[PDB]
Short mmCIF file of all heavy atoms in Angstrom, two decimals:
data_model
loop_
_atom_site.label_atom_id
_atom_site.label_comp_id
_atom_site.label_asym_id
_atom_site.label_seq_id
_atom_site.Cartn_x
_atom_site.Cartn_y
_atom_site.Cartn_z
N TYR A 72 25.17 -149.18 -27.81
CA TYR A 72 25.11 -149.96 -29.04
C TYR A 72 24.01 -151.02 -28.95
O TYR A 72 23.23 -151.21 -29.89
CB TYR A 72 26.45 -150.61 -29.34
CG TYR A 72 26.38 -151.59 -30.49
CD1 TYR A 72 26.58 -151.17 -31.80
CD2 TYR A 72 26.08 -152.93 -30.27
CE1 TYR A 72 26.51 -152.06 -32.85
CE2 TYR A 72 26.02 -153.83 -31.31
CZ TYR A 72 26.23 -153.39 -32.60
OH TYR A 72 26.13 -154.30 -33.64
N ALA A 73 23.96 -151.72 -27.83
CA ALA A 73 22.96 -152.77 -27.65
C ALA A 73 21.57 -152.20 -27.67
O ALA A 73 20.66 -152.82 -28.18
CB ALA A 73 23.21 -153.50 -26.36
N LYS A 74 21.40 -151.02 -27.09
CA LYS A 74 20.12 -150.36 -27.06
C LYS A 74 19.74 -149.95 -28.47
O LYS A 74 18.60 -150.12 -28.88
CB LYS A 74 20.17 -149.15 -26.15
CG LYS A 74 18.80 -148.55 -25.86
CD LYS A 74 18.91 -147.25 -25.07
CE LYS A 74 17.54 -146.62 -24.91
NZ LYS A 74 17.61 -145.24 -24.36
N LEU A 75 20.71 -149.45 -29.24
CA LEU A 75 20.44 -149.02 -30.60
C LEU A 75 20.06 -150.17 -31.52
O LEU A 75 19.12 -150.05 -32.30
CB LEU A 75 21.66 -148.29 -31.17
CG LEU A 75 21.58 -147.82 -32.61
CD1 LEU A 75 20.53 -146.72 -32.79
CD2 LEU A 75 22.96 -147.31 -33.02
N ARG A 76 20.81 -151.26 -31.45
CA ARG A 76 20.67 -152.36 -32.41
C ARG A 76 19.81 -153.52 -31.91
O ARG A 76 19.37 -154.37 -32.70
CB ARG A 76 22.06 -152.88 -32.83
CG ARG A 76 22.95 -151.84 -33.49
CD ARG A 76 22.31 -151.21 -34.71
NE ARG A 76 23.14 -150.18 -35.31
CZ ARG A 76 22.71 -149.35 -36.25
NH1 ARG A 76 21.45 -149.43 -36.70
NH2 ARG A 76 23.54 -148.44 -36.76
N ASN A 77 19.61 -153.58 -30.60
CA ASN A 77 18.83 -154.65 -29.95
C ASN A 77 19.22 -156.08 -30.38
O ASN A 77 18.37 -156.89 -30.74
CB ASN A 77 17.32 -154.41 -30.13
CG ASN A 77 16.49 -155.29 -29.21
OD1 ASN A 77 16.93 -155.65 -28.11
ND2 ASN A 77 15.31 -155.67 -29.66
N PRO A 78 20.52 -156.40 -30.33
CA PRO A 78 20.97 -157.72 -30.68
C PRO A 78 20.64 -158.73 -29.57
O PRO A 78 20.35 -158.34 -28.45
CB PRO A 78 22.48 -157.52 -30.81
CG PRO A 78 22.78 -156.56 -29.74
CD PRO A 78 21.62 -155.59 -29.80
N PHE A 79 20.70 -160.02 -29.88
CA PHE A 79 20.66 -161.06 -28.85
C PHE A 79 21.98 -161.00 -28.08
O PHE A 79 23.02 -161.17 -28.66
CB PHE A 79 20.46 -162.43 -29.51
CG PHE A 79 20.54 -163.59 -28.56
CD1 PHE A 79 19.86 -163.59 -27.36
CD2 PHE A 79 21.29 -164.70 -28.90
CE1 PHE A 79 19.93 -164.68 -26.49
CE2 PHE A 79 21.36 -165.79 -28.05
CZ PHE A 79 20.70 -165.77 -26.83
N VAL A 80 21.93 -160.73 -26.77
CA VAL A 80 23.13 -160.50 -25.97
C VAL A 80 23.49 -161.74 -25.12
O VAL A 80 22.68 -162.20 -24.29
CB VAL A 80 22.97 -159.27 -25.05
CG1 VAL A 80 24.22 -159.04 -24.23
CG2 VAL A 80 22.65 -158.01 -25.85
N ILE A 81 24.69 -162.27 -25.34
CA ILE A 81 25.19 -163.49 -24.67
C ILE A 81 25.57 -163.21 -23.20
O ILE A 81 25.18 -163.96 -22.29
CB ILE A 81 26.36 -164.07 -25.51
CG1 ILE A 81 25.81 -164.54 -26.88
CG2 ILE A 81 27.11 -165.18 -24.82
CD1 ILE A 81 24.76 -165.61 -26.79
N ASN A 82 26.32 -162.14 -22.99
CA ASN A 82 26.75 -161.72 -21.64
C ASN A 82 26.18 -160.33 -21.39
O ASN A 82 26.55 -159.37 -22.07
CB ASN A 82 28.29 -161.70 -21.58
CG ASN A 82 28.88 -163.05 -21.19
OD1 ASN A 82 28.50 -164.07 -21.72
ND2 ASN A 82 29.83 -163.05 -20.28
N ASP A 83 25.24 -160.24 -20.45
CA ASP A 83 24.47 -159.01 -20.21
C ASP A 83 25.42 -157.89 -19.85
O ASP A 83 26.27 -158.07 -19.00
CB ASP A 83 23.53 -159.24 -19.03
CG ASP A 83 22.68 -158.03 -18.70
OD1 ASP A 83 21.64 -157.86 -19.35
OD2 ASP A 83 23.05 -157.26 -17.79
N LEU A 84 25.24 -156.72 -20.47
CA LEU A 84 26.15 -155.59 -20.28
C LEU A 84 25.95 -154.82 -18.98
O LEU A 84 26.91 -154.41 -18.37
CB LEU A 84 26.08 -154.63 -21.47
CG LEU A 84 26.57 -155.33 -22.76
CD1 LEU A 84 26.16 -154.58 -24.00
CD2 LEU A 84 28.08 -155.51 -22.70
N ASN A 85 24.72 -154.59 -18.57
CA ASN A 85 24.50 -153.82 -17.35
C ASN A 85 25.02 -154.51 -16.11
O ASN A 85 25.52 -153.85 -15.19
CB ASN A 85 23.03 -153.42 -17.20
CG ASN A 85 22.68 -152.24 -18.10
OD1 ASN A 85 23.43 -151.26 -18.16
ND2 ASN A 85 21.60 -152.35 -18.82
N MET A 86 24.98 -155.84 -16.09
CA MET A 86 25.54 -156.60 -14.97
C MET A 86 27.06 -156.40 -14.86
O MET A 86 27.65 -156.54 -13.77
CB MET A 86 25.23 -158.09 -15.11
CG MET A 86 23.76 -158.45 -14.96
SD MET A 86 23.00 -157.92 -13.41
CE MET A 86 24.07 -158.77 -12.31
N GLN A 87 27.70 -156.08 -15.98
CA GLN A 87 29.15 -155.87 -15.98
C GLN A 87 29.60 -154.62 -15.22
O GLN A 87 30.75 -154.54 -14.84
CB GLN A 87 29.71 -155.89 -17.41
CG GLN A 87 29.51 -157.25 -18.06
CD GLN A 87 29.90 -157.26 -19.51
OE1 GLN A 87 30.67 -156.41 -19.95
NE2 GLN A 87 29.29 -158.16 -20.30
N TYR A 88 28.70 -153.68 -14.95
CA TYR A 88 28.96 -152.58 -14.02
C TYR A 88 29.10 -153.15 -12.58
O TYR A 88 30.02 -152.80 -11.83
CB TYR A 88 27.84 -151.53 -14.04
CG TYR A 88 27.79 -150.69 -15.30
CD1 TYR A 88 26.76 -150.83 -16.21
CD2 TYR A 88 28.78 -149.75 -15.57
CE1 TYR A 88 26.70 -150.06 -17.36
CE2 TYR A 88 28.73 -148.96 -16.73
CZ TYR A 88 27.68 -149.13 -17.62
OH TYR A 88 27.61 -148.38 -18.79
N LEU A 89 28.19 -154.03 -12.22
CA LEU A 89 28.15 -154.62 -10.88
C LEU A 89 29.29 -155.58 -10.60
O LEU A 89 29.81 -155.65 -9.46
CB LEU A 89 26.83 -155.34 -10.68
CG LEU A 89 25.56 -154.49 -10.75
CD1 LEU A 89 24.38 -155.34 -10.33
CD2 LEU A 89 25.63 -153.26 -9.88
N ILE A 90 29.68 -156.34 -11.61
CA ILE A 90 30.79 -157.26 -11.52
C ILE A 90 32.12 -156.55 -11.18
O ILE A 90 33.01 -157.16 -10.58
CB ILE A 90 30.89 -158.12 -12.79
CG1 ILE A 90 29.74 -159.12 -12.82
CG2 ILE A 90 32.23 -158.85 -12.87
CD1 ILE A 90 29.56 -159.80 -14.17
N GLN A 91 32.23 -155.26 -11.49
CA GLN A 91 33.41 -154.47 -11.14
C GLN A 91 33.49 -154.12 -9.65
O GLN A 91 34.49 -153.55 -9.21
CB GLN A 91 33.46 -153.20 -12.00
CG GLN A 91 33.71 -153.47 -13.47
CD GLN A 91 33.66 -152.20 -14.29
OE1 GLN A 91 34.43 -151.29 -14.04
NE2 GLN A 91 32.72 -152.10 -15.21
N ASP A 92 32.47 -154.44 -8.87
CA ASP A 92 32.37 -154.03 -7.46
C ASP A 92 32.17 -155.30 -6.64
O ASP A 92 31.14 -155.94 -6.73
CB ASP A 92 31.21 -153.05 -7.29
CG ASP A 92 31.10 -152.49 -5.90
OD1 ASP A 92 31.59 -153.10 -4.93
OD2 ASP A 92 30.44 -151.42 -5.76
N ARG A 93 33.17 -155.66 -5.83
CA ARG A 93 33.09 -156.89 -5.03
C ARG A 93 31.89 -156.90 -4.09
O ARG A 93 31.33 -157.96 -3.80
CB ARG A 93 34.37 -157.12 -4.21
CG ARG A 93 35.58 -157.56 -5.01
CD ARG A 93 36.76 -157.88 -4.09
NE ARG A 93 38.02 -157.61 -4.78
CZ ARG A 93 38.60 -158.43 -5.66
NH1 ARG A 93 38.07 -159.60 -5.97
NH2 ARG A 93 39.73 -158.07 -6.25
N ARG A 94 31.49 -155.72 -3.59
CA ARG A 94 30.33 -155.63 -2.69
C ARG A 94 29.04 -156.06 -3.40
O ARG A 94 28.17 -156.72 -2.81
CB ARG A 94 30.14 -154.20 -2.15
CG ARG A 94 31.36 -153.65 -1.39
CD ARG A 94 31.28 -152.14 -1.18
NE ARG A 94 31.41 -151.42 -2.44
CZ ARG A 94 31.53 -150.11 -2.57
NH1 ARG A 94 31.54 -149.32 -1.50
NH2 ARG A 94 31.64 -149.58 -3.78
N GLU A 95 28.93 -155.67 -4.67
CA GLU A 95 27.74 -156.02 -5.49
C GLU A 95 27.75 -157.49 -5.82
O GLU A 95 26.70 -158.15 -5.81
CB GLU A 95 27.68 -155.16 -6.76
CG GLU A 95 27.61 -153.66 -6.50
CD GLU A 95 26.26 -153.21 -5.96
OE1 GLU A 95 25.27 -153.96 -6.02
OE2 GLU A 95 26.20 -152.07 -5.45
N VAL A 96 28.95 -158.02 -6.09
CA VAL A 96 29.11 -159.44 -6.42
C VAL A 96 28.67 -160.28 -5.22
O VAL A 96 27.83 -161.17 -5.33
CB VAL A 96 30.57 -159.75 -6.84
CG1 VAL A 96 30.86 -161.26 -6.83
CG2 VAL A 96 30.86 -159.18 -8.22
N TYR A 97 29.19 -159.96 -4.04
CA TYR A 97 28.83 -160.73 -2.85
C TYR A 97 27.34 -160.62 -2.50
O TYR A 97 26.72 -161.59 -2.04
CB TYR A 97 29.70 -160.27 -1.68
CG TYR A 97 31.04 -160.96 -1.59
CD1 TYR A 97 31.63 -161.59 -2.69
CD2 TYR A 97 31.73 -160.99 -0.38
CE1 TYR A 97 32.85 -162.25 -2.57
CE2 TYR A 97 32.93 -161.65 -0.25
CZ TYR A 97 33.51 -162.27 -1.34
OH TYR A 97 34.74 -162.90 -1.17
N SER A 98 26.77 -159.44 -2.72
CA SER A 98 25.36 -159.23 -2.45
C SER A 98 24.50 -160.15 -3.33
O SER A 98 23.52 -160.73 -2.85
CB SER A 98 24.97 -157.76 -2.64
OG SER A 98 23.56 -157.64 -2.49
N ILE A 99 24.89 -160.33 -4.60
CA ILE A 99 24.14 -161.22 -5.53
C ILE A 99 24.30 -162.68 -5.10
O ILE A 99 23.33 -163.45 -5.09
CB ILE A 99 24.59 -161.01 -7.00
CG1 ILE A 99 24.15 -159.63 -7.47
CG2 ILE A 99 24.02 -162.10 -7.92
CD1 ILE A 99 24.86 -159.12 -8.71
N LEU A 100 25.53 -163.06 -4.75
CA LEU A 100 25.78 -164.43 -4.30
C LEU A 100 24.91 -164.79 -3.10
O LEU A 100 24.28 -165.86 -3.05
CB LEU A 100 27.26 -164.63 -3.95
CG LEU A 100 28.29 -164.52 -5.09
CD1 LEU A 100 29.70 -164.57 -4.52
CD2 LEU A 100 28.09 -165.59 -6.14
N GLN A 101 24.84 -163.87 -2.14
CA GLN A 101 24.02 -164.07 -0.94
C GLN A 101 22.54 -164.17 -1.31
O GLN A 101 21.84 -165.03 -0.80
CB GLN A 101 24.19 -162.93 0.06
CG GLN A 101 25.52 -162.91 0.76
CD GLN A 101 25.54 -161.92 1.93
OE1 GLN A 101 25.58 -160.70 1.76
NE2 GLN A 101 25.54 -162.47 3.14
N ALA A 102 22.07 -163.29 -2.19
CA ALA A 102 20.66 -163.29 -2.58
C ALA A 102 20.25 -164.60 -3.29
O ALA A 102 19.11 -165.03 -3.19
CB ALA A 102 20.34 -162.09 -3.44
N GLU A 103 21.21 -165.25 -3.94
CA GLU A 103 21.01 -166.53 -4.62
C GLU A 103 21.26 -167.78 -3.78
O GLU A 103 21.23 -168.92 -4.31
CB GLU A 103 21.94 -166.59 -5.83
CG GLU A 103 21.65 -165.51 -6.85
CD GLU A 103 20.27 -165.63 -7.43
OE1 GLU A 103 19.82 -166.78 -7.58
OE2 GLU A 103 19.62 -164.60 -7.70
N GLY A 104 21.54 -167.60 -2.49
CA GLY A 104 21.77 -168.71 -1.59
C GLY A 104 23.06 -169.47 -1.87
O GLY A 104 23.14 -170.68 -1.64
N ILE A 105 24.07 -168.76 -2.36
CA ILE A 105 25.35 -169.36 -2.70
C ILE A 105 26.29 -169.16 -1.50
O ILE A 105 26.47 -168.03 -1.02
CB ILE A 105 25.93 -168.74 -3.98
CG1 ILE A 105 25.05 -169.12 -5.18
CG2 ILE A 105 27.37 -169.16 -4.24
CD1 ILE A 105 25.29 -168.24 -6.40
N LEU A 106 26.87 -170.26 -1.02
CA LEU A 106 27.82 -170.19 0.07
C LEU A 106 29.02 -169.33 -0.32
O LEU A 106 29.55 -169.47 -1.41
CB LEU A 106 28.32 -171.59 0.44
CG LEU A 106 27.29 -172.57 1.04
CD1 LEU A 106 27.90 -173.93 1.24
CD2 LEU A 106 26.76 -172.06 2.37
N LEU A 107 29.41 -168.43 0.57
CA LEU A 107 30.59 -167.61 0.37
C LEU A 107 31.21 -167.35 1.73
O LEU A 107 30.61 -167.70 2.76
CB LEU A 107 30.24 -166.31 -0.41
CG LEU A 107 29.58 -165.13 0.35
CD1 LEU A 107 29.58 -163.86 -0.49
CD2 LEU A 107 28.16 -165.45 0.79
N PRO A 108 32.44 -166.82 1.78
CA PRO A 108 33.01 -166.55 3.10
C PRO A 108 32.20 -165.51 3.89
O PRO A 108 31.69 -164.57 3.30
CB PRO A 108 34.41 -166.00 2.78
CG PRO A 108 34.70 -166.47 1.38
CD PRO A 108 33.37 -166.49 0.70
N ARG A 109 32.07 -165.70 5.19
CA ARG A 109 31.54 -164.66 6.07
C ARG A 109 32.37 -163.39 5.87
O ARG A 109 33.60 -163.45 5.89
CB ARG A 109 31.65 -165.09 7.53
CG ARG A 109 31.08 -164.06 8.53
CD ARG A 109 31.01 -164.64 9.93
NE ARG A 109 32.35 -164.90 10.44
CZ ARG A 109 33.10 -164.02 11.13
NH1 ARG A 109 32.66 -162.82 11.43
NH2 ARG A 109 34.30 -164.37 11.53
N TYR A 110 31.70 -162.26 5.68
CA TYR A 110 32.40 -161.02 5.35
C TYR A 110 31.73 -159.77 5.92
O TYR A 110 30.55 -159.78 6.30
CB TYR A 110 32.54 -160.90 3.84
CG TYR A 110 31.28 -160.50 3.14
CD1 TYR A 110 31.03 -159.18 2.83
CD2 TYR A 110 30.32 -161.46 2.81
CE1 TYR A 110 29.86 -158.81 2.19
CE2 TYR A 110 29.14 -161.10 2.16
CZ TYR A 110 28.91 -159.77 1.86
OH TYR A 110 27.78 -159.41 1.21
N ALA A 111 32.50 -158.69 5.95
CA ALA A 111 31.98 -157.38 6.33
C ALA A 111 32.64 -156.31 5.46
O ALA A 111 33.82 -156.44 5.05
CB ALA A 111 32.22 -157.14 7.81
N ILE A 112 31.88 -155.26 5.15
CA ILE A 112 32.34 -154.24 4.23
C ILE A 112 32.78 -153.06 5.06
O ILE A 112 32.01 -152.57 5.90
CB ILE A 112 31.23 -153.77 3.27
CG1 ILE A 112 30.74 -154.93 2.39
CG2 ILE A 112 31.75 -152.63 2.38
CD1 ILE A 112 29.46 -154.62 1.65
N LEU A 113 34.02 -152.63 4.85
CA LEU A 113 34.51 -151.40 5.48
C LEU A 113 34.57 -150.28 4.43
O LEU A 113 35.50 -150.23 3.62
CB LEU A 113 35.89 -151.59 6.12
CG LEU A 113 36.40 -150.36 6.91
CD1 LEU A 113 35.63 -150.19 8.22
CD2 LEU A 113 37.89 -150.48 7.19
N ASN A 114 33.58 -149.40 4.44
CA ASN A 114 33.56 -148.24 3.57
C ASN A 114 34.25 -147.08 4.29
O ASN A 114 33.87 -146.72 5.41
CB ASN A 114 32.11 -147.88 3.22
CG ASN A 114 31.46 -148.89 2.29
OD1 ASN A 114 30.30 -149.31 2.49
ND2 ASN A 114 32.21 -149.32 1.30
N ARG A 115 35.28 -146.53 3.67
CA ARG A 115 36.06 -145.46 4.24
C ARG A 115 35.86 -144.20 3.41
O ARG A 115 35.90 -144.24 2.18
CB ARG A 115 37.53 -145.87 4.22
CG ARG A 115 38.45 -145.01 5.05
CD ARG A 115 39.85 -145.58 5.12
NE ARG A 115 40.13 -146.32 6.35
CZ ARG A 115 40.48 -147.60 6.43
NH1 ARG A 115 40.60 -148.37 5.34
NH2 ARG A 115 40.74 -148.11 7.62
#
Side-chain angles (χ1 to χ4, degrees):
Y72 172 89
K74 191 186 175 190
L75 178 66
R76 300 304 178 191
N77 194 30
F79 174 48
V80 180
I81 295 299
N82 273 47
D83 180 84
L84 296 164
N85 282 315
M86 292 304 301
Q87 297 173 22
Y88 289 111
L89 298 188
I90 289 167
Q91 293 176 59
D92 184 337
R93 287 185 210 280
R94 302 166 292 188
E95 301 288 345
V96 165
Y97 275 21
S98 175
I99 291 162
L100 294 173
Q101 289 191 287
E103 298 298 325
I105 293 163
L106 294 175
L107 78 168
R109 181 171 66 90
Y110 76 95
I112 298 167
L113 185 72
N114 290 135
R115 193 173 261 120

